[PDB]
Structure formats: structure tokens, C-alpha cells
């Protein structure tokens, strides 16, 4: 044929559907499954009101007639199919035209059989008749003559052949074609491809696109007339080498962090150090790279974050080697570490030690500065990584990832990073498993929101939102607070780490500080809202909030004022991400308590909410902000990237010797950790 | 009415529905969207055919009239509503005989108009065309007179009550009630209940039994008859207080984990003190509820694990009272305790210390034993807690709430544990959120199986297989690894932590080891399996293994062998569910490989897999075995179950005081970590 | 269509199916395949013979002949 990419399946103008016999009948063969019929009958009624071309071949009407009797086949088994079925094609066919009709569109039986085909006259007549049918917007249903018959899919398929059709679909009950029989372990489902298989290669061999789905999924045309990756394709068409489909990529990356796991000792220390070399002396390939990528933004201009983010500059990359310096310098121990040092009983020596996580995959938008950042991270944490940026600053990402692949092949020398370029349908990407372990976010709100609702069964470090809050005391120095939360809102407002909310104590509306404030974010152009108690309070005063779990970015910033500090508390409790909270006051009592009784991941008292930034902490450089209630809170440096693992190195022990029989007793001695 | 409760709904005789006006039109009012009424017909024949009477109301007929003109319409518009209806309703007539014939039921016609239920004579006359209908298995169609008409669901309502039907299924767009408008925080989803609203009070005032759906719900019949809480159920029974629905329960523990948060002196530890003299206290009455318990149980008869772990002994009570004293003793440091002490400038000291996490949530089959240990679990952890255990051991679970109920209430008395019996449908349980952290489920694989397969968006800590392997090599003495895989499998060979594997060298089948070990397996009854190169080692020898990633639990073990340590470690990688291995053998060199080689969650060198108890680590007591990739490695005692939170005292820091500006430098002196 | 009737198995299969039909009180109502064509009486008659019927009514327009 000519296509050969799921992406080419929006522009074939002549299709051609089969429906299976057992995707109509209901789970008898005595009957009829009518919703996936109607769901079938919808979807073609589409695609044709679209403007494609399509002439159904409906399978199994025997059903329809095995049903309709129901009463003579009966009285005649006590007494005494294909009859069946001619009837049932009768019956049938007005169903079709019921439904059909419904849409408007107009159907035509039309009836072959496979002698049809060889005899060249008669090809010329079916072939007369369809063209004739097809310039007058019907869609033919094109059934066997059952009368002459002694399961109708090379019918099909040799249809399309003769009409040489662009695609043929193939519905059926399987969702595809795997490596193996399924009762096997590698059952790995061939969504590509270099019985039905047979007839699929005749098809094929005669210039025609094939594909076969499963009838039970929804929307199974629309869906893969989109591109969508489902069913099974089939093409040879065999391009390029397009090394890794998706997965080779997952497992090399379990291989190579196989590999580093045996090179700590200043093995990727002095390979990160390569890594930052090769960044300051050879920048004027990636900055032109960049600076190439950036024009070809340009003309696109897509978003001024995007359009901002994506630069570039020598100072940034001279910022990031001093940062892949320091994570060199510092990232002395972080592996192997052992935790615990104890025994249990003579010659039974625990202890638990530090080792990685496995497949990491981040995802972020253009900001190619951040990747040789976390691969500095993945490499000094000796674990695998996966990459997936966005549109723009692709090959931008190229040139960082030669770099860092030259930087890996000095020692150690296994590529254990890739890249998965090409619009690999991130939700496809996800739906891995048994690979994937830590997906990594990094763009903004909406990419993290996307995945979270995007991601399961799949662990997600990151959060999504960044309500944080600010309460006042009554014993709060004014100034104080009021340059507090001046910086706090007003150093980059659209920070993930952002007040978007200011709460207050009820006393200090008296000495109209609240006025102080106002006039202060008015000196920063802030477009403030209101709380209800707020709006209750003051003649009209500014305008009331929309929502108090509302987000704002921009100069915004609701607020509102409570009675008591354990009032702040619940609506924190109330509205809080538990992500960031502030205290400014003078009264160490009410500051334990707000410690304590605070739950966020993170709570300062007379700081600001944009110290959350983990290198900020000397947590050496961050990698996330991370608010799930596991393993990770907020600023996570390197050691969230780090699990444990038991080890035991007895003699001769056994368990039933440290029963009663065997003079094993117990000791746990905390021996002193390493 | 009668009926009270969801699980009432399988006993209603008379139903009634009425498809809402938009549930059948496609996004136009101009068509028929047909799949969901396809959908609703075959479930209503369903109904049907098991023997309940159903009369369909169908609203909306004017979108079939308005699709079948579509053309003197369009002429009319261009030169110039109820007689499209009126056309519709002919035409949809038949469309619904078509179909429902298929299901071989027949239907009938009716129209009616509200006036037709007000004069009385009338309403003879139409009760008595209904009931003469539904005496001859007819499912009559009810549409409005549109004839006579100037949306049609106080029609359904009032006629439901002449006919004093069982239930009103009431089909529509909307999933439920809310408590409030949905842009609003808090629409609670009022699934019971103490426009349609009206009719709905109307209807039940009548005696009948109202349920409002959402049509786009697949099997939304089916499902609500199976009394799923789904849609909006109306009755005002309101019998029992019967505390938490679900989730005020979840509240209520947060409250409590909050309050335990300021109770940590040998608060808790008094108060687990407390919960241990209770046990050994009051064991008289717990041990007649688990024997009257356990009787039930009998005669039910339903599985000898389950009939077995059910048991309880005060020996039982007595091993529980020391594991809870030594809870108590040692659970002394775990919470509030920091873990770095840092100095980033003057006056700014960053420390991060432990805390709870939340809400967790146990699952476990009838097994009363661990209910306090778990318990102990919690309110050493101050954190709060949940329960669910299966059908046994209920009224004992009651007798151990109590008991537990009374330990807290000395001491901090908030009741920050609850217990969700009366069958809460795990499934919706697992299906809540921002209340629930840690699934926990402790019975068995199956129960652990079913959970991650159903869990979905939540932290669920545990594992599923048990897949352990046990490597030989050649340099290890004989007897040893004899005794050792003797031990390894016939200690407790149900056990999670089992060997249903065992690999061995490949040069070590001349030595007939292989065979000394059949031997013992055959001693102790071991049905073992062969590798396939096994398969091809020997004559006949054991019977081929059937899939290298089966489980057994019973007595057996496959058994394959295998050249070199690293083709171990790749089928390990391979099949191995990184659980739990061992090594055996005497070169320390390859001891080291295979440990850093290895990836399971733990790894030994010459002990017993039976060694992974956790209290035999000194681990204190144990609450679940994880496999997850993330924060908890098989054997979790109580740090499993404590997450970090940064905290930060400054005076009066401000980040862009850190800038240029500000005489604010950068020191991250590792202060002592208390 | 004519064709159908001068290959054998095609003549056990049709009868068959024809058969099968009367024997369940069914008027089946016996078309040409159009479809598969360039006043179709020649096909009544060689239809009644392969069954062999009792009587072949063949109404027309004429009412008879002279
Ligand atoms: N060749 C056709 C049947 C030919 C016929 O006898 O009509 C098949 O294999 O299905
Ligand atoms: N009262 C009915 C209509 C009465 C009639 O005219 O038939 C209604 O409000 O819908
Ligand atoms: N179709 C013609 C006969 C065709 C032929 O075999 O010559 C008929 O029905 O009379």
C-alpha cells in the first residue's frame, strides 16, 4: 500500500469494516448482543457523514434467524440452519435500515460469495454494482449468499482487495496479537506487525493497510482513526531502526543501573565531573543548537513562560556546572550507606543499607537546563533514567544528551539514559508497568494535574497545587509582617511556593494593619479579594473571593481573618494543600502550638514561604516538591531517591534453630552503624 | 413504602422506569443518541425475563419526528413542533417493537396525559388497560398524548402511585443529589436520602420506593438492583443512628491523630500499658465471644485456614499481652524525633523531625489476634487508624473495640479508631480519598491480590507473591545447604516468605546433590516440578514444571539448575518478585557479586528464608511485608509508618534578604541531630 | 440465478436450503441475484422442475393465448 504509521490514518478515503460474528451475538449464539452492535452501527454512521467511504460486512446472521423462530425449531426438535439464516439476513437487513435511516443515511443489501470473486465477468458486475452504489451515498451491506454455502473473512479481505480499498479494519473479540500464546510467559501484545494473520498478509500483499481490533472496546474506529495505538497494525514498511519501540529502552535502563550500581568510588563522582566539563567546553555547539531551536520557537509563538524558559545563556550553563560540581563534591556517600548495624545472635549480623530505585522517567516542558540537572542527579544516584521533554528544545535535548552520553561512556560506559522523542503519547507512556517506578514531573501545575489525573497504579512524586498560607498574631510585630509578606508574595508571584491566601488574627483588624497591607500590595499592583468573614466585615471594601481553594498565579491574593489561632488552624486543615504555612508572631506558646497542630509538609515561623527551595537548605540540589503523604515531603534532594534493602550474612543459622531445640537465643545489640 | 435499604432491591415485583429526555438524544435534540438506549432496552429486557414487571415511560419522542422530517422542516424554515412529536411517536413505536421483539418479549402502545389520572372514571379504565396488559407478559410503552399537550415525570410518579408500584427507577443526566450546588466546596453527593426532588418526596408520600440515576452509568439497572450505592436513594426509614456512614469516622480519626499528636510523655506508652492489663484482665469475656463465635462459624464450615486462625487461646492472650508490654517499653523515641540539625545563617536553624500520617486503614481476614497488635500499632504511632476484617470474629472484633476503646479513653480519651462493619463494600471504601493513606492488608494473597487489582489512586503497603528463590553454588558444603533448604521449605511451607523454587549450580549435578535432595523432599512429601533444562538433564526424572512464575504454598518446590551465578541472578531478575533470596556457598568474592547483584528486598548469605519476621530482626513488632519500590522494604515495623516534616525558625529572614541586598550568607553546618 | 442451477453442487445445495424451509411452514420468496446480473421465467420453470413441483401458475398480463 502507501500508509504506514497510525499517524497516516486520517486520510485514507475508502474504508471497509468487517464485523465478527461474535461481537453481534450474544453470548449464546442463540440471540443477539445488541449494544456493541449499536455502537458499531454509530460509529460507521460517522465516519461516513465525515465523508469516508465505507461498506460494512456484517457477519453471523444466523443469530438473528435462530432467534426469530424460536418456536418451530423448537416444535421440530422433538419431531425431527442455513434456512435460519436467510431469514434472519431478511430481518436483519430491516433492522440496518431502522437504524441507519436514523442517521438518515441509506443502506442497500447487497450478497457474494467467494466463487463470485473467480469468475472475472461477475467481478466486473459486483464491481459495477458497488461503484454505481457507492457514487450515491449508500453504504452496501455486503453479506455471503448463505443460500449457496455449504468464517467469511478472507470474503472480506479479497473485497477490499478488488475494490483496493485504503484500510481495512477487521474488528473480532480479540484485543490483538501477542508474541506467544497467551498461556505463556512474554505474551507481549504485537501492536505493530513487520487465519486472520494470513489474511492479513494476503491483504497486505495485495497493497491494502489492515488492522485488527477489539470489538468490545469503545469507540474502537474513532479511537484508532485518530492514530491511537491499539489493536494491531501491520505494515513492513520497516523505516528506520528507531532503536527502542518503548520498552528495550525501560529494560537497558534496568541494565545500566545494573552496571553503575558497581562504580561508587569517585566512579560517577569523576563522571559527573566529566559531565560538567564537557558542558563548559563544548557550549557553543548546544548554545547554537539552542539558539536555532529558540528561532524555530519564535515563529510559533507559543507562551511567554515557554518562550522565556526555553533561553539559554552561557551564565546559565556556567550555573549549571558549578551545581554539577557541587552535586559532584557532595555526592560522596550516598549510596551503599548502610542505615542499621545489629545482632541478632552469635554469627547473625543484620544491617540495612542504601540502594537505588531503579527506572526513573521525568517529564517536564522546554527547559533543557533542567535536564543535565537531573541527569547529574540520576547518574550520582547510580539509578537508570528516562527522559521526556516536550515539543520545542528537541534538539536542543539531543545535544545535552550526546554530551551526557559521552560523559557515561568514559567510565562505566553503559548508556543507562535515553530519550523517548517522537510524540510517544505520554498517557501510553504511563500506562507501562513493571518498569516505570518514580514519575517525576516538573513543567508547572497543569502537567502535574494532567498526570495525576492521567497516572495509575504508578507512583507520582510531585504535587499540583500551591495554596500555601500565612497566619498573623496578635503579637506580631507590623512591620515585621508587613515586609514578610511583602517579599513573600512579591519575589515571584507566580511560584509554586505562593501565598495565595493571608490570614490574620481577628484583634489586628483594630490597629488597621489590614488597611497597612492593602496599601502595601496596591504599592505592588495585587488584586486582592475578600474573605465572607471579611466581606461581613467592612462597608464594601474590596471585592468578595470567588473560592477560598482558588489558585491565582498572578498578582492575587485572598484574605481573610479569624477569631483564634485554632480557628486559622482548621480552615488551613479546611483548605490547605498541607503544602507550606507560615507563623509571624512574638509568643513561643502559640508558636509550639502551631508547630505541632500544623500538618502541612513544611512550617516556618518569622521565614518566608520562598525559602522552600531545598538547595536553599544545603539539601544539595532539589529534584522536587513532593506532597504525598509517603516517603517525601516537599523538598526532596537526593536521599528520596534512595531505598533500602535488608541484608543477613549468617553462618550456619536456621529458623527452627532459634527454637526450643537449637541453642540460639536472641540479642538485637545495636551494633554501632557505619 | 416497605423497602428500606439497597439490599432490599432485590425483591421488588413491580418496577417502573422513565427515560429522561436526554438520555436518548444525541448532543443535539436533532437525532438519537441510540447506544444508551440500546443499552437501557437490553437491560430492561432483562429484567423482564427474570420475572419482574416493568412499564417504561419513555420521554423525548420530538428528536425521532424532527431526524425523520429533516427535510419539509428545512423547507418550511425557509417559506414560513408537536406534530414532529407526533410522527416520532409512530416511528419510535416501531423502532421499540423491533428491538424488543428481538428479545422475542412484545410491547404495546399507551398514551395518557396528567388529566387522564384526575377524573376517576378515567382512571379505571386506563388501571384496568394496564393491569389486563401486564397479565399477558406485554411490556407497555407510556408516552404523553402530545396530541393533547400544550417534563412528563410527575407523569411517572403519580403513575407508579395508582399503580402502587414497587420501585421507581427514575433514568437521567445527573449522577445524584449534592448537598449543595456543585460550584461549591462540600457537594456532598447525598447518595440516601432522609423537580425531580419534589416528585421524588411526592412519589415516596405515595408509599413507593424512588431512585434517580445517571443514565451514561453502564448496567445502572443491573447495578442498582444489585443494591451498589449508586445514583440517589430516597427513603426517611432513618431506624438507627448508626454513627458513620463512612467517612465522619475518617474525620473523627484525623481529629483523634491530632489529638494523640500532644500526648507523647509515656502517654501513649501508659495508655498501650493500659490496653495490655485490659487484655490480661478481662480475656473471660473475649475468649466465650471468640468461643461463641467460632461456634457460628462451624456450621458454616468454611475454610480450615480460616477455621483454624479464627482460634484464640488465653496462651494466645498471653503472647499478645508480653509482644503489647514490649510495644509499650520500646516504643519510647519514635515520634517528634529529628533527624538533621542545620544552620543555613545566623538565626536560621532547619531541623527535620518524625510524624504520623494520617489515616490508615487495615484489611484482614477473621484473625482477632492481630486486631490489638495492629492497635498497638496505631496508638504508638498516634497516628489514627481504621478496621475491616471479613464475617467471623465480628462480634469478638466488638469485644476487642471495646476493650481498645477503653485503654485510649484513660488517657488523651479521644477515640481516634473506629471499625466498618454491616458488609461496607471494600470496593466503595478503597474508592474514597483524601481521607485514607495506607491501605494495609494483612490476610493472605488472595485478599492482598484482590486489593491492588482493585485499588486504584492509593498508597496500598504490602505484597502479593511469594517467589523466593534459593541459590547453590558449587563451592557450598552439601549437608549444609541440605538442612538449610530442608528448613527453608518444611518449616511452615504455607508461609509467604517460601521457596517455591530452588536454583542450583550447574556443576553440582555430578555430585547427585540433586538427588540427595529429592531424597528429602520425597522424605517430606514435596511434590516438586523440573526446569526445563532440567527437562532435558535427565531420563523422565520429576514431571515438567507448568510456568516458572506459578505459586504452590503446598508441598512444592520446582527445581531447575543453571551454568553460572549471573544466568541465576538474570532468571532471578527474571521471574524472581524481588521478595526475598538467599545465597549458599563459601567464596565471599562471589558473596559479594551476588549480594550487590541481587535487587530483592532482602537478601541472605547462609541463613533461612524463614528468617524474614521482623521481630526476628529486632525490628520490634512487625505490621506487613512491602514490595513496593518506595519507602518500605519488606519486614515494616513502626518507622514504616512515620513520614518527615521540615521545620525552620528564623528571627526575621526574608529570602531576597539572601540576595545581593541583604547581609545574608550561606553556612549549612551540620549541627548535632539530636 | 440461472447459473445457480447448472452447477450440481449448487442444485443440492439450494434444495436443500428450499427443503429445510417448506418443511417449516415458511413461503420463501424466491428472487434472482440481481447483483449478479446484466424476463426471468425461464428461471420459475427450471425452478419447478428441479423440485419438481405439481403445478406451475404463471400469472402475466395477457389473458391467454390465441
Ligand atoms: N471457498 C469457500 C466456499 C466455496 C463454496 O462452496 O461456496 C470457502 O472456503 O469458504
Ligand atoms: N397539568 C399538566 C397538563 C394538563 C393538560 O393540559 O393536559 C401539566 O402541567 O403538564
Ligand atoms: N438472466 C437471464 C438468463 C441469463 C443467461 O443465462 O443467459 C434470465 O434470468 O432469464
Redesign the interface.
Known amino acids: 500500500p502507501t500508509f504506514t504509521e497510525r499517524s497516516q490514518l486520517k486520510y485514507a478515503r475508502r474504508l471497509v469494516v468487517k464485523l465478527g460474528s461474535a461481537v453481534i451475538t450474544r453470548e449464546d449464539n442463540h440471540?443477539?448482543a445488541?449494544?456493541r452492535?449499536?455502537?458499531i452501527?454509530?460509529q460507521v454512521a460517522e465516519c461516513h457523514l465525515e465523508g469516508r467511504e465505507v461498506m460494512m460486512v456484517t457477519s453471523g446472521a444466523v443469530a438473528?434467524g435462530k432467534?426469530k423462530?424460536?418456536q418451530?425449531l423448537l416444535m421440530?426438535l422433538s419431531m425431527?440452519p442455513?434456512?435460519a439464516a436467510?431469514?434472519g439476513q431478511s430481518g436483519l437487513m430491516?433492522?440496518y435500515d431502522?437504524?441507519f435511516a436514523?442517521?438518515?443515511v441509506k443502506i442497500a443489501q447487497?450478497?457474494?460469495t467467494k466463487p463470485?470473486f473467480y469468475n472475472e465477468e461477475?467481478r466486473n458486475?459486483?464491481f459495477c454494482?458497488l461503484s454505481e452504489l457507492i457514487s450515491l451515498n449508500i453504504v452496501p451491506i455486503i453479506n455471503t449468499?448463505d443460500?449457496?454455502?455449504?468464517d467469511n473473512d478472507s470474503l472480506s479481505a479479497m473485497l477490499a482487495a478488488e475494490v483496493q480499498a485504503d484500510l481495512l479494519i477487521l474488528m473480532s473479540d480479540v484485543d490483538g496479537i501477542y508474541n506467544k500464546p497467551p498461556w505463556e510467559?512474554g505474551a507481549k501484545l504485537m501492536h505493530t506487525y513487520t487465519s486472520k494473520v494470513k489474511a492479513a498478509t494476503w491483504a497486505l500483499d495485495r497493497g491494502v493497510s489492515v488492522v485488527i481490533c477489539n470489538g468490545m472496546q469503545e469507540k474502537a474506529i474513532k479511537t484508532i482513526i485518530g492514530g491511537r495505538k491499539v489493536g494491531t497494525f501491520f505494515t513492513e514498511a520497516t523505516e528506520s531502526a528507531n532503536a527502542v519501540p518503548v520498552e528495550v529502552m525501560a529494560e537497558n535502563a534496568?541494565t545500566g543501573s545494573?552496571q553503575m550500581?558497581?562504580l561508587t568510588p569517585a566512579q560517577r563522582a569523576s563522571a559527573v565531573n566529566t559531565l560538567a566539563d564537557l558542558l563548559v567546553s563544548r557550549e557553543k555547539f548546544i548554545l547554537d543548537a539552542n539558539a536555532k531551536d529558540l528561532a524555530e520557537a519564535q515563529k510559533s509563538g507559543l507562551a511567554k513562560p515557554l518562550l522565556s524558559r526555553l533561553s539559554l545563556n552561557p551564565a546559565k550553563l556556567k550555573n549549571l556546572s558549578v551545581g554539577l560540581k557541587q552535586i559532584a563534591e557532595d555526592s560522596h556517600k550516598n549510596v551503599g550507606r548502610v542505615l542499621r548495624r545489629?545482632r541478632?545472635a552469635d554469627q547473625?549480623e543484620?544491617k540495612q543499607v542504601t540502594?537505588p530505585?531503579?527506572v526513573l522517567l521525568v517529564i517536564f516542558e522546554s527547559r533543557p537546563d533542567s535536564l543535565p540537572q537531573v541527569a547529574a542527579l540520576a547518574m550520582a544516584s547510580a539509578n537508570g533514567l528516562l527522559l521526556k521533554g516536550g515539543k520545542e528544545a528537541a534538539h536542543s535535548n539531543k545535544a545535552l544528551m550526546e554530551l551526557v552520553k559521552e560523559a557515561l561512556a568514559t567510565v562505566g560506559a553503559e548508556h543507562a539514559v535515553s530519550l523517548v522523542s517522537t510524540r510517544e503519547e505520554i498517557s501510553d507512556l504511563l500506562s507501562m508497568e513493571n518498569h516505570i517506578?518514580?514519575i517525576i514531573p516538573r513543567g508547572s501545575s497543569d502537567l502535574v494535574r494532567s498526570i495525576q489525573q492521567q497516572s495509575?497504579?504508578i507512583?507520582v512524586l510531585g504535587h499540583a497545587e500551591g495554596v500555601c498560607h500565612v497566619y498573623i498574631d496578635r503579637d506580631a510585630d507590623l512591620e515585621?509582617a508587613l515586609?514578610?509578606a511583602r517579599?513573600?508574595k512579591c519575589?515571584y508571584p507566580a511560584a509554586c511556593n505562593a501565598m495565595e491566601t493571608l490570614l490574620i488574627h481577628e484583634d489586628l483588624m483594630s490597629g488597621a494593619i489590614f488597611g497597612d497591607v492593602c496599601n502595601m500590595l496596591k504599592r505592588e499592583g495585587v488584586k486582592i479579594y475578600a474573605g465572607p468573614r471579611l466581606n461581613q466585615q467592612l462597608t464594601f471594601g474590596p471585592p468578595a473571593a470567588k473560592?477560598?481553594?482558588h489558585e491565582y498565579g498572578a498578582l492575587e491574593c485572598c484574605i481573610e481573618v479569624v477569631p483564634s489561632l485554632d480557628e486559622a488552624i482548621n480552615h488551613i486543615?479546611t483548605y490547605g494543600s498541607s503544602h507550606t504555612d507560615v507563623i509571624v508572631t512574638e509568643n513561643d506558646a502559640a508558636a509550639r502550638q502551631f508547630?505541632?497542630?500544623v500538618?502541612?509538609?513544611?512550617?516556618?515561623?518569622?521565614?518566608?514561604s520562598?525559602?522552600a527551595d531545598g538547595f536553599?537548605?544545603?539539601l544539595g540540589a532539589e529534584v522536587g516538591i513532593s506532597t504525598?503523604?509517603?516517603?517525601?515531603?516537599?523538598?526532596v534532594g537526593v536521599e528520596g531517591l534512595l531505598?533500602?534493602?535488608?541484608?543477613?550474612?549468617?553462618?550456619?543459622?536456621?529458623?527452627?534453630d532459634?527454637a526450643e531445640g537449637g541453642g540460639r537465643t536472641?540479642?538485637?545489640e545495636t551494633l554501632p552503624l557505619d
Chains 1, 2 share one sequence.
Open positions: 440471540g443477539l445488541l449494544g452492535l449499536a455502537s452501527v454509530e438473528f432467534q423462530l424460536a418451530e421440530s425431527r442455513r434456512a436467510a431469514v430491516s433492522l431502522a437504524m436514523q442517521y438518515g447487497v450478497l457474494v463470485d461477475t458486475n459486483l454494482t449468499n443460500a449457496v454455502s455449504p510467559d534496568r545494573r550500581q558497581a545489629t541478632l547473625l543484620l540502594v530505585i531503579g517506578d518514580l495509575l497504579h507512583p515585621k515586609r514578610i517579599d513573600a519575589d473560592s477560598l481553594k486543615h508547630l505541632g497542630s500538618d502541612s509538609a513544611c512550617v516556618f515561623h518569622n521565614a518566608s520562598r525559602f536553599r537548605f544545603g504525598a503523604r509517603i516517603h517525601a515531603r516537599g523538598p531505598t533500602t534493602k535488608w541484608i543477613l550474612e549468617g553462618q550456619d543459622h536456621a529458623a527452627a532459634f536472641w540479642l538485637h
